Amino acid sequence: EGVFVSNGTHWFVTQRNFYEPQIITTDNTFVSGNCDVVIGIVNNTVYDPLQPELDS
Amino acid sequence: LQIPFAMQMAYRFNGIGVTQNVLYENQKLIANQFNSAIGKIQDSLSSTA
Numbered sequence A: 001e002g003v004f005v006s007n008g009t010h011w012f013v014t015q016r017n018f019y020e021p022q023i024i025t026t027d028n029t030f031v032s033g034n035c036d037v038v039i040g041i042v043n044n045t046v047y048d049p050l051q052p053e054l055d056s
Numbered sequence B: 001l002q003i004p005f006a007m008q009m010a011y012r013f014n015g016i017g018v019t020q021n022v023l024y025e026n027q028k029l030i031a032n033q034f035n036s037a038i039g040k041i042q043d044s045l046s047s048t049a
């Protein structure tokens, strides 16, 4: 829910009606298919909260 | 507020309970279906009063 935005250097997901930037993660996003069909797609890291947990 | 049209339609698809990816994965087909449907309005309106 919400929408992707950038301030020119960093990528955030945020609500439609009130600017509140959030770091992009596998919890605030969902996946479908490979890049090649999607017009206007761009590259960034999507963070995974599990990795420090397993690293312990 | 300006918004790109392929993003506006994903909000409108999401509004009817169809997941956003269903627009982007079909965007060329959806655009052709719309453009062709508008064309049929001209043919209908021109053909019959």
Ligand SMILES: *[C@@H]1O[C@H](CO)[C@@H](O[C@@H]2O[C@H](CO)[C@@H](O)[C@H](O)[C@H]2NC(C)=O)[C@H](O)[C@H]1NC(C)=O
Binding pocket: A007, A008, A009, A010
């Ligand atoms: C876009 O947003 C990011 C995160 O708010 C900004 O990066 C931070 O900038 C401040 C000030 O230079 C630093 O103290 C932080 O350490 C930066 N964080 C990161 C993750 O790098 C970034 O400056 C913003 N871009 C613009 C053009 O304003």
Ligand SMILES: *[C@@H]1O[C@H](CO)[C@@H](O[C@@H]2O[C@H](CO)[C@@H](O)[C@H](O)[C@H]2NC(C)=O)[C@H](O)[C@H]1NC(C)=O
Binding pocket: A041, A042, A043
């Ligand atoms: C996003 O990143 C991928 C790689 O992770 C980029 O894919 C490469 O793009 C160049 C230029 O088209 C090709 O020469 C490489 O062969 C591609 N590599 C792979 C593994 O496909 C992709 O272009 C990046 N997207 C953007 C918009 O820059």
Ligand SMILES: *[C@@H]1O[C@H](CO)[C@@H](O)[C@H](O)[C@H]1NC(C)=O
Binding pocket: A039, A040
């Ligand atoms: C936006 O327009 C530019 C040319 O002005 C084009 O190169 C680009 O691929 C377009 N991107 C999208 C998301 O339509």
